[PDB]
Amino acid sequence: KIELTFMFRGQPQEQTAYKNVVKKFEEKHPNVKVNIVVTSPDQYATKLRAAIAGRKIPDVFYFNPGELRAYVNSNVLLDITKYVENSKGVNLQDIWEKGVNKYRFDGEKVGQGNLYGLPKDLGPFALGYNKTMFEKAGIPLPDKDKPYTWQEFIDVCKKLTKDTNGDGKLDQWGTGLNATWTLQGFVWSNGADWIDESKTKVTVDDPKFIEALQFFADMQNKYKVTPSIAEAQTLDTYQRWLRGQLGFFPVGPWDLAAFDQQIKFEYDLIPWPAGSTGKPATWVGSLGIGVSSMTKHPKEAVELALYLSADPEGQKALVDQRVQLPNSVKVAEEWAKDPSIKPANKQEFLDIINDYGHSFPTEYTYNGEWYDEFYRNLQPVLDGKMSAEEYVKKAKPKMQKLLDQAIEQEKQASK
Numbered sequence: 001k002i003e004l005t006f007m008f009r010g011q012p013q014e015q016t017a018y019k020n021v022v023k024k025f026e027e028k029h030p031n032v033k034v035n036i037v038v039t040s041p042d043q044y045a046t047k048l049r050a051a052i053a054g055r056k057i058p059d060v061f062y063f064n065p066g067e068l069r070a071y072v073n074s075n076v077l078l079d080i081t082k083y084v085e086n087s088k089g090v091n092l093q094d095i096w097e098k099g100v101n102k103y104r105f106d107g108e109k110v111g112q113g114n115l116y117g118l119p120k121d122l123g124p125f126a127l128g129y130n131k132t133m134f135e136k137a138g139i140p141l142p143d144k145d146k147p148y149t150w151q152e153f154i155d156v157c158k159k160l161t162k163d164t165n166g167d168g169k170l171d172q173w174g175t176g177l178n179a180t181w182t183l184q185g186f187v188w189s190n191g192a193d194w195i196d197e198s199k200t201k202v203t204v205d206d207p208k209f210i211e212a213l214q215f216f217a218d219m220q221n222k223y224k225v226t227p228s229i230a231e232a233q234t235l236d237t238y239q240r241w242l243r244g245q246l247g248f249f250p251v252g253p254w255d256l257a258a259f260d261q262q263i264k265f266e267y268d269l270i271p272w273p274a275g276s277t278g279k280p281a282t283w284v285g286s287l288g289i290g291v292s293s294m295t296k297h298p299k300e301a302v303e304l305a306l307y308l309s310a311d312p313e314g315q316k317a318l319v320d321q322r323v324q325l326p327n328s329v330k331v332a333e334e335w336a337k338d339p340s341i342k343p344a345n346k347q348e349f350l351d352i353i354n355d356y357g358h359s360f361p362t363e364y365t366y367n368g369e370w371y372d373e374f375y376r377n378l379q380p381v382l383d384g385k386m387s388a389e390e391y392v393k394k395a396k397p398k399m400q401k402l403l404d405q406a407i408e409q410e411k412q413a414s415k
């Protein structure tokens, strides 16, 4: 007799996994029916923004931690603190503190106070390598703890780049990294960032940032350890990694089901190569599961969010279906130590969460438009048509104006 709308995003395997777990929820709560609105990851932001613009908000939905403050100011998210406190034996204290705290807001700052969402997951973005490829080539395996230097990384990528079937054409490459998701680690491990410590000034014109961005573009254009521009257009590097054509490619826990189904070679996880700091860097993603401020059924809505985030049965089903690592810290630690579950070094995921992972810069700002503008016009750098130095000088004032507006608009919306 109760109906909830649950809006979310995922790759195909994730959609299937969450749809299955929602059916489990419906079995446990036969009086609640959940109507699903699901999109691809790239389509999600536009569809959720449209729902919010029309004040027709789904009862339960994924959202970006960087939107928390804005969503609170516009009364989008219900304060679910009391519903969670009164809930049957769930203890958020077993859940990653870093995850829980992204969705707390005390009226002034994120990280403390009332709960406005529950963590879907934490998403450490690790580096994978193709072990089959290394062993066929006779190249010593990467170390599981000590990062390659950038020069060492290029050296091995060059050794992996070859014509394996002897037809005269390269058909295997060291890597093929997507700047949207992998530039951050090179920037951060080189002691740079998109914005300063105060999170109010754009710093992409830092020589350290420029060096990292130029090195990144140089993998394709100068060192030539990737498929060509045309080859990547023909078949993107994610697909080429699945087919066993690339030595290195990132791995997130959300990839594991897809990789189980499609990857036939052996692969394992390693630290990212490190720049001038000598310390590896990468990001830890997260999404929140929120409840509409306007929902007619707040108890049931929070029960669904809890079932996906913290309930041992709901969580076990998600982890079993290989679309995330456990939200419970103790369960995650035991998971990582189980050698029957691959990759062998899935401990690297926890090392990222605990030690060397960072947040996206937009998690700190009121909106992310300033950062989207950096990426919007980045491709000529990546394809060698414009230098990193020339681009960041051009982009910086456009980014700064947008960041300044985010800062101001925060002041005006929180009155």
Ligand SMILES: OC[C@@H]1O[C@@H](OC[C@@H]2O[C@@H](O)[C@H](O)[C@H]2O)[C@H](O)[C@H]1O
Binding pocket: 010, 011, 041, 181, 238, 250, 251, 252, 254, 255
């Ligand atoms: O394109 C391959 C895909 O991109 C990387 O993941 C980035 C991002 O994170 C998830 O939340 C979204 O599904 C995805 O677009 C990974 O390399 C791979 O999943």
Ligand SMILES: [Ca+2]
Binding pocket: 163, 164, 165, 166, 167, 168, 169, 170, 171
């Ligand atoms: Ca060939």
